[PDB]
């Protein structure tokens, strides 16, 4: 049927802060993956209506994309780095789950996940 609402990105009752790990995840990691060649399918939620994928949100119970993560970082939604890392991994895992091994988009997600992981090993300690 129709698409669900996208994940929330701002909460006025949620506290905001600027930790060193999250500012690194914003200025380096998400900036590295966002300008990447294969980034565009993950820059926004999956439009299951336009893609004619009626079972996507029946299988993917935890949708996630890089646009949501970007907006969550900019709005200081995260309290810690593990939140954003788990969002990235949820995105990649959803992509692997719904599709099949060897699909073009699976290879693209694998590329972006490899780049994310090699970037994440340089995570700075908090200030």
């Amino acid at each position: 049927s129709m698409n669900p609402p996208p994940p929330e990105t701002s909460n006025p009752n949620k506290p905001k802060r600027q930790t060193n790990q999250l500012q690194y995840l914003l200025r380096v990691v998400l900036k590295t993956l966002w300008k990447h060649q294969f980034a565009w399918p993950f820059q926004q939620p999956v439009d299951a209506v336009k893609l004619n994928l009626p079972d996507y949100y029946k299988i993917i119970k935890t949708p996630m994309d890089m646009g949501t993560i970007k907006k969550r970082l900019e709005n200081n939604y995260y309290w810690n780095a593990q939140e954003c890392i788990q969002d990235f991994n949820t995105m990649f895992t959803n992509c692997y789950i719904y599709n099949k091994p060897g699909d073009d988009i699976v290879l693209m997600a694998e590329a972006l996940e490899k780049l994310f992981l090699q970037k994440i090993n340089e995570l700075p300690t908090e200030e």
Partner: protein, 375 residues
């Protein structure tokens, strides 16, 4: 229309494919009518024309291994001209010789970007898919039928000393009157043999092409009728069936005649899916690249689009915001363009980033979405 300060050498370079590729200067050509066993790239769906530059981006491990094997050998693969794309039926094709490659590390996966160029037409004798999943093609090289002058068999010996020649319409009148004199020995006049003369056809094509590209024919256009005909066919925005019929032609004379008939008849370019929605006309065609108005480019996912540059376009909706990422024409931002009626993707609207550029905006329409139409 307007004027241009764009430098048409940047489109041909395919700068969007990363840094300076490792370029090859060698050339491999197979003898006519000979048979060769050539690998076929799986995801290639284009009807490649000899002389046409083909860019590709491959990230499947099988494709990368095959490209490495080709780089270590003769650097030539087969591009099947599919008559039926769904069932992978191919009777004709064109060879492509890799002249630049680049494997990119510090990338999520191993990806290889390649600039190749079509070389020789061929007939598909046999297609056999190997155990690896990649398929090989036993292939017969189709020769280029170069016919002698139509007056060579009827030429008077005493007039042999007058067949070498030292306001263009008067010059062409004198040319027709001097070259095809012995036509009075046949059942046909001179102006009929002019309709099968390579140079006359080439000059008429040169006019019809001066319409689009302002580059002088003194250097940009070839003198050989075969090379000229292939260059013209590589930039003619026609559908796949017409392109296959044009590829089947072996004689450069027939090729030039068919191309001129297409250029005279075909006037409107409509949506292939709609068949009844005019997108552009022949008059708005203009060349932003050295290769002509239409050239093959590759998107970030290996898909190949034969983009045709036009000044104006009608009956299109614009989807999304402009973007400079992976732009085929540097300094321009593209915007997805769909048909107004069927919403099918027709191409992109390119807009200039600097306010000093010219033209400030144009349309790149993919050939696969267009259909030629005569009123």
């Amino acid at each position: 229309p307007n004027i241009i300060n764009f430098d048409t050498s940047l489109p041909t370079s395919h700068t969007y494919l990363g840094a300076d590729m490792e370029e090859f200067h060698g050339r491999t050509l197979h003898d006519d009518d000979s048979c060769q066993v050539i690998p076929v790239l799986p995801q290639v769906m284009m009807i490649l024309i000899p002389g046409q530059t083909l860019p590709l981006q491959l990230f499947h491990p099988q494709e990368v291994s095959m490209v490495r094997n080709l780089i270590q050998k003769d650097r030539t693969f087969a591009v099947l001209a599919y008559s039926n794309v769904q069932e992978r039926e191919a009777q004709f094709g064109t060879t492509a010789e890799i002249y630049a490659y680049r494997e990119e590390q510090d990338f999520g996966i191993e990806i290889v970007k390649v600039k190749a160029i079509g070389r020789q037409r061929f007939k598909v004798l046999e297609l056999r898919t190997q155990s690896d999943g990649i398929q090989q093609a036993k292939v017969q090289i189709l020769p280029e039928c170069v016919l002698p002058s139509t007056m060579s068999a009827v030429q008077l010996e005493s007039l042999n000393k007058c067949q070498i020649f030292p306001c263009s319409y008067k010059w062409w009148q004198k040319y027709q009157k001097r070259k095809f004199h012995c036509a009075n020995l046949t059942s046909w006049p001179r102006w009929l043999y002019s309709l099968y003369d390579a140079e006359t056809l080439m000059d008429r094509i040169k006019k019809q092409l001066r319409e689009w590209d302002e580059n002088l024919k003194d250097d940009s256009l070839p003198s050989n009728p075969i090379d000229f005909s292939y260059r013209v066919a590589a930039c003619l925005p026609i559908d796949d069936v017409l392109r296959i019929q044009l590829l089947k032609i072996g004689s450069a004379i027939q090729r030039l005649r068919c191309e001129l008939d297409i250029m005279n008849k075909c006037t409107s370019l409509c949506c292939k899916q709609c068949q009844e929605t005019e997108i552009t006309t022949k008059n708005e065609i203009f060349s932003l690249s050295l290769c002509g108005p239409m050239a093959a480019y590759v998107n970030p996912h290996g898909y190949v689009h034969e983009t045709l540059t036009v000044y104006k376009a009608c009956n299109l909706n614009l989807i999304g915001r402009p973007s400079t990422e992976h732009s085929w024409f540097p300094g321009y931002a593209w915007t997805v363009a769909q048909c107004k009626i069927c919403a099918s993707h027709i191409g992109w609207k390119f807009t200039a980033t600097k306010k000093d550029m010219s033209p400030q905006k144009f349309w790149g329409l993919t050939r696969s979405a267009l259909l030629p139409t005569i009123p």
